Amino acid sequence: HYPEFSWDTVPIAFHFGKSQGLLTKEEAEFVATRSNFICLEKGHATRTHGTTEAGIEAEARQLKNLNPKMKVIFYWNTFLDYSMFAAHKEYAKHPQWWLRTTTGELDRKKGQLMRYDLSNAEFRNWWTNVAAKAVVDGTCDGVFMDAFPQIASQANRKLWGDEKFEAIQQGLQDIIQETRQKIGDDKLIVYNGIRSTPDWSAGFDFAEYTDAAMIEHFGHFQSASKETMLRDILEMQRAAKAGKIVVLKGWAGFTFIDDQAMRKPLTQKRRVAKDSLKFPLACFLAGAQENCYFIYNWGYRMENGCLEWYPEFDKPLGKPVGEMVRDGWKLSREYKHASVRVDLESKEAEIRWR
Amino acid sequence: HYPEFSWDTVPIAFHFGKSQGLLTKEEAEFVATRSNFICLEKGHATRTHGTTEAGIEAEARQLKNLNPKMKVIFYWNTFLDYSMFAAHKEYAKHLRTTTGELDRKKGQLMRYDLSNAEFRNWWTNVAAKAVVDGTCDGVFMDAFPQIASQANRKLWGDEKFEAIQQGLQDIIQETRQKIGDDKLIVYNGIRSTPDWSAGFDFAEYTDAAMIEHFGHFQSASKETMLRDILEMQRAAKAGKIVVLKGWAGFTFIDDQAMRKPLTQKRRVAKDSLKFPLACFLAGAQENCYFIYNWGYRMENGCLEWYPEFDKPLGKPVGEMVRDGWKLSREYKHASVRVDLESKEAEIRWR
């Protein structure tokens, strides 16, 4: 029930939202002819369709009409009560569920966004019904469960108490199982995700229930050291070899959280994105197996480079002819039509195409 | 390093030559006040300046003195050994087919061996003399569909053909290296035909592509016109320049049409503008340029003007909308509709 995967060219997935409306026909064709795997973000097409659920459903139909093999993934945050969903008004009707801290204040991110009590079974029941409405009744093929590291953050202990924290971690396991129970075996569960930092690293997890994990921070944020980059690549290799989907999120030399980089004119962003592609692309191809996908851009809104294309993505790749080879911080991989080399320490990389 | 672009009116570029001499005061001012983007063709001003290089250099200085924003592009054929260049005698001082006959287009013009690196270094040196040492702002690299034509496998063999294809990629890369990142590389081009199509290519190095045959030659079908428009839109959204070469109801190759009087030529040119102009506006994005005439010599309609090119246009306020062969587009001061099947067109100026 995985997306149809191919080595003909670099395997590419999409993950973004266009808030101002559906993809144009030209945008939908551009996307649908270039990938079999897309998650549509919170807010997608809300300006014209009112709710994310409505926008995503109409978009899922458009894309699959163009590419019937496309797997369209419903973005549904596991932890946060985002306002641009019809579901938000239903959650507002259940104040008995609302998470509170040890002092009684409502637990809200940046003081505005409520965080879910995953230990509450009624909530979990409602939350999984939202997902199953999108993927069973609707036209999506799976769900993207965001925010696992936010749930597991030790900082939440100061807010909840240790006992409620353990209850909420248990509730994360519960809500994944119940998600699977409700959407069936033919549907995809994607979650965020694999993460490598100096103090804490999460590998592919909950494997009895989940199908795909994103490596959202590859090469950036707290995951920019050679040690954490190597761990992300090795975990992709290990997880994919064991039959899972892995989506590696590359960043085009900067991210949407870098205020100075985001202030730069579009021409400068494109120069940076072109110069910055080779290294994360070589890292991805060094460790990539079947069912591994690359994403490369600087954010999750359509305009954050998400519809950019690069000639590297059209070049013949072909099946891997040998396993990844590692010597110290240096990695290399042979494909039928390309050779890859990358040094995690110096950030030096080389891709030799046929 | 792009030409300065505006939506105030239809964005216009020029692409022609005047072999009898430089533009006159009036002709120079006409072009300089109406566009920031011109390619000067082979032969320009050769009668009085001897070579295309010297004629284009003198013209580039004249036009830029009138409009300092003017980007002037040097015509340098990527494949063909034209005689009205000083560089022709250097080529003469230094490509074989399988039968040994000299490879000459229509028996006259030699064709270049892009595999040979000595040639490539010379060729790019000629481009660099014109744009780095000289006053031009970039180079127009013609003839890419000729180079790629599969029929050349018959003339050269599969091995040499693929050497030449690689050579084209090498010459483009070597051009950019020698002229720098602040100069423009224009090439011909995007082409859509029923059996063979090329979109924007070599985007690592090139800035601009011409759609030379829009609506005409082998690209007159609704299928190929739509391909051209869609590729303009994609490439310009990707950050490239696109030059759409419209034809004024006929072309310089149609003998009978070319033998008609100017008054009839102008009548047909006026009647034929709305359709190709609406196709361009339907898909146009930033850094898209329209050209409208019946050829590449100054006198082939190239300094004709139309009120449509003075009308307020304004920024696009919506995306191209396509239903079947029908396109529409909303600008701040005009609504566009065109039907590629019936060739009906409306430009509702406001």
UniProtKB/TrEMBL annotation, chain A:
The organism's place on the tree of life at top rank: Bacteria
Protein name per Swiss-Prot or TrEMBL: Glycoside-hydrolase family GH114 TIM-barrel domain-containing protein
InterPro entries attached to this UniProt entry: Aldolase_TIM (IPR013785), GH (IPR017853), GHL15 (IPR029455), TAT_signal (IPR006311)
SUPFAM superfamilies noted in UniProt: (Trans)glycosidases (SSF51445)
